[PDB]
């Protein structure tokens, strides 16, 4: 639904501005969209979604063993685990458990 003049002017402008020049259907235009953006898996929001829980936990465990960080929570579960040994509720040996 375009005149030859209008069609040829649109093709010249598309070449000037770096757009698709050959006639391309909407299905094949997805190839252009695929390579003009980063894949969702490659975006920093995606692969850096979580904080590095290994670093935070391990750093603060090392700082506790060094005497520079007081972990009130870990102190709480160390006292509970200590009172369970005196009560006899100790974790069994792996493999050599109650069942066999």
């Amino acid at each position: 639904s375009l005149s030859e003049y209008a069609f040829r002017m649109s093709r010249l402008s598309a070449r000037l501005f770096g757009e698709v020049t050959r006639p391309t259907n909407s299905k094949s235009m997805k190839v252009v969209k695929l390579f003009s953006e980063l894949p969702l898996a490659k975006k920093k929001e995606t692969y850096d979604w979580y904080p590095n829980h290994h670093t935070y936990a391990e750093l603060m465990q090392t700082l506790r063993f060094l005497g520079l960080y007081r972990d009130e929570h870990q102190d709480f579960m160390d006292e509970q685990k200590r009172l369970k040994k005196l009560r006899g509720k100790e974790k069994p040996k792996k493999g050599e458990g109650k069942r066999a």
Binding site: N52, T55, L59, T62, L66, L68
Partner: protein, 154 residues
Amino acid sequence: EEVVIPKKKTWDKVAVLQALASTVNRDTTAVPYVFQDDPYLMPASSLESRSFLLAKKSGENVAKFIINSYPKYFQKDIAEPHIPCLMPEYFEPQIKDISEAALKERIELRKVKASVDMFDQLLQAGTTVSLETTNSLLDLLCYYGDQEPSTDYH
């Protein structure tokens, strides 16, 4: 008609900060800026002045000791532009091959004992050590008197 554009003015990245600093003078009511500006924490004597700074420096040394002891925990770089000075330091030789090129590393790291031992091993193997490399080893050995430079902790 012609319009005359003024010539550009160029200054260092710290020039504006230095211009603003010139406008202010020392505050006589305050202790030196290095100290915490708090009546309980301000040094109240010449001795506390020295000891309070030594305590702060000790804290910084302890932090640096941890950073270099556990580089893994401080390797996530989120700074843009990158800040090289805020990264962990690696003081150990990473070239394990016995060669003259690998020896140069130990001299750059100032490992007097490692370098001397490796130089001896290199000489026993019979490989050639350049005069410049030998001179660099002598510079390291002569300057420090064949004694290890002080380190944070072993």
